[PDB]
Amino acid sequence: LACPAERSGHVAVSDGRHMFVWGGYKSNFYLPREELWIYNMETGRWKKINTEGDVPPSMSGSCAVCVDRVLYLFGGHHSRGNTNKFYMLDSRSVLQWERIDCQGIPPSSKDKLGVWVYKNKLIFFGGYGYLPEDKVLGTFEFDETSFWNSSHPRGWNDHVHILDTETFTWSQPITTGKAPSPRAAHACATVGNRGFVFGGRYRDARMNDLHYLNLDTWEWNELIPQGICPVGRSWHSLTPVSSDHLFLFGGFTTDKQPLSDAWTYCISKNEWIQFNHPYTEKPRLWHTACASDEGEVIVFGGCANNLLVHHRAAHSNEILIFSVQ
């Protein structure tokens, strides 16, 4: 019974039955780049396989999706900085990574972003990284804390970029409405043609605002739920669990509190409902969450305390199972 090492900042994507886990870092360096960990949501068993081909660099903060058991990976932070390279791994059939020579203007090199999937489009939003190579659609805001501790300052963007998998070509939609502020470590979830985004870090706040981009018309909408809302946070997970509900777990507050609360957002009612679960002593940030075909949300990895104090950080290899349906 092999078991993967603890990590935060990894990626995890799922087909509803199997959950693929790649990358991340820990304390006590990056997790090995060639490994792909497969967790069976039914048997609860892990399996490690080695990948070949254009293996991506070891990274934290990468953004990944699974569409029809093809894995796509964008962005991240490796030993020499952020990237905007795009990879594909076909898991349908030893697995081979392919780095894609994309057409069009790619996003700026960045990590800690999110993605929506809608038909042939991968739609990426926000994140943290270098100044863009062009005045492209959207805004970018420097993080002044990066001016004095590195050789290349970095900041937050509110960019929306489309990767069209019919041609592997980058574009940007002309949107209407008020886009969210630039941010990183937000969480994105897709239901129907609505690409939701909750929270994230921007300047001196970790936020609790909720927006959605209509992925057909490209109109931004801010959602203002009535009643109690979850505390503002970054590094939380947000997962669709039905055509009407999003599941929220964990994260990190403005004043640096690890979180163990869970909520469901009822889309039809525009209302948050706090979710009762047995992991109140297991806060997690920079974990991943994947929904199963069996009505559960599978959380893996992440950190139980303030990961910014790297020498004390408590990175986890635990699986937390939330029974949402």
Ligand SMILES: COCCOc1cccc2ccc(-c3nc(CC(=O)NCC(=O)O)cs3)cc12
């Ligand atoms: C040496 O520095 C102190 C130790 O830093 C660190 C140690 C270990 C892991 C780290 C991961 C990320 C970051 C940073 N991310 C940002 C941009 C952002 O939006 N983050 C989300 C948020 O802040 O909620 C600015 S720094 C720092 C880390």
